[PDB]
């Protein structure tokens, strides 16, 4: 409603940059701290993982750098980037192309 994350999917692997970038837009009336995390440890390097975003449509750009491939076979969770802002969370799935 008051904020959003683009794109809606992060693509790594064959044909892709080793680097993906997220854009987080804050349309609340006040400046907001965000935290950007991954639901699988030691899978990506997120930079910066915390920053402030200006209100009224300000935005921050966040690098996501894949460190290893996910192991669905080793029953890791389906990998997600999670952005947290105010009391809310938006998840962005990660795909690795073979």
Residue numbers in the entry: 1049 to 1146
What does the paper say about this structure?
Spd-2/CEP192 proteins, defined by a conserved “Spd-2 domain” (SP2D) comprising two closely spaced AspM-Spd-2-Hydin (ASH) domains, play a critical role in centrosome assembly. The conserved centriole/centrosome protein Spd-2/CEP192 (fly/human nomenclature) plays an important part in mitotic centrosome assembly in humans, flies, and worms and also in the diverged centrosomes of Dictyostelium, which lack canonical centrioles. In flies and worms, the phosphorylation of Spd-2/SPD-2 at centrioles recruits Polo/Polo-like kinase 1 (PLK1), which then phosphorylates the large coiled-coil protein Cnn/SPD-5 to stimulate the assembly of a Cnn scaffold, and the internal molecular interactions that allow Cnn and SPD-5 to assemble into scaffolds are beginning to be elucidated. ASH domains are present in several proteins associated with centrosomes, cilia, flagella, and the Golgi complex, but the functions of these domains remain largely unknown.
An evolutionary analysis reveals that most Spd-2/CEP192 proteins contain additional ASH domains located close to the SP2D domain (one in Drosophila melanogaster and six in Homo sapiens; see Results). To partially validate the AF2 structural models, we solved the high-resolution structures of individual ASH domains from DmSpd-2 and H. sapiens CEP192 by crystallography (DmASH3 and HsASH7) to resolutions of 1.93 and 1.0 Å, respectively, or by nuclear magnetic resonance (NMR) spectroscopy (DmASH1). Instead, DmSP2D is essential for PCM scaffold assembly, a function that does not appear to require the additional ASH3 domain. In contrast, Spd-2-∆ASH3-GFP was present at centrosomes at only slightly lower levels than WT Spd-2-GFP, and it appeared to be distributed more evenly between the centrioles and PCM than the WT protein. A 3D-SIM FRAP analysis suggested that Spd-2-∆ASH3-GFP was initially recruited to centrioles and then spread outward into the scaffold more quickly than the WT protein. The deletion of ASH3 did not significantly perturb the assembly of the residual scaffold in cnn−/− embryos, but the deletion of the SP2D, or of ASH1 or ASH2 individually, appeared to abolish the assembly of this residual scaffold. Collectively, these data indicate that the SP2D and ASH1 and ASH2 are required for Spd-2 and PCM scaffold assembly in vivo, while ASH3 is not. In flies, the single additional ASH domain is not essential for the Spd-2 function (as Spd-2-∆ASH3-GFP can rescue the female sterility of Spd-2 mutants) nor for Spd-2 scaffold assembly or for targeting Spd-2 to the centriole/centrosome.
